[PDB]
Amino acid sequence: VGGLYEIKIPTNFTIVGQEEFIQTNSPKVTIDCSLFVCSNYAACHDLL
Amino acid sequence: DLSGFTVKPVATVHRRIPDLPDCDIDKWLNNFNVPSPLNWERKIFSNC
Numbered sequence: 001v002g003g004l005y006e007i008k009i010p011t012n013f014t015i016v017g018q019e020e021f022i023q024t025n026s027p028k029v030t031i032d033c034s035l036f037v038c039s040n041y042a043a044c045h046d047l048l
Numbered sequence: 049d050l051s052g053f054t055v056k057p058v059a060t061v062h063r064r065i066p067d068l069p070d071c072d073i074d075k076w077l078n079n080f081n082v083p084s085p086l087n088w089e090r091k092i093f094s095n096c
């Protein structure tokens with residue numbers, strides 16, 4: 001309108017909080033391949 | 049991380065139903081009235 005534009009400017013405000021979880025680690029899984037594949041069985045450990 | 053061990057069994061548990069009769073399987077197999085393949089006979093042995 002002439003040289004001027006209509007703008008909504010804030011007249012009041014507050015502070016808002018926002019949470020953000022970022023994963024940086026995970027459970028350190030470890031496998032005993034021999035115990036998993038063959039358990040206690042000697043005949044399996046031989047073939048493995 | 050060394051290979052997985054298992055605790056050694058310290059005793060043996062053996063269970064069987066006592067005082068069951070003999071199955072007599074030989075008496076039935078040695079019976080001289082032998083059937084042909086056409087009329088092959090069956091016997092079922094349990095609790096013996």
Ligand SMILES: *[C@@H]1O[C@H](CO)[C@@H](O)[C@H](O)[C@H]1NC(C)=O
Pocket residue numbers: 011012013
């Ligand atoms: C701003 O907003 C808060 C919450 O609605 C209110 O308590 C406060 O009086 C307001 N201030 C003005 C200048 O409007």
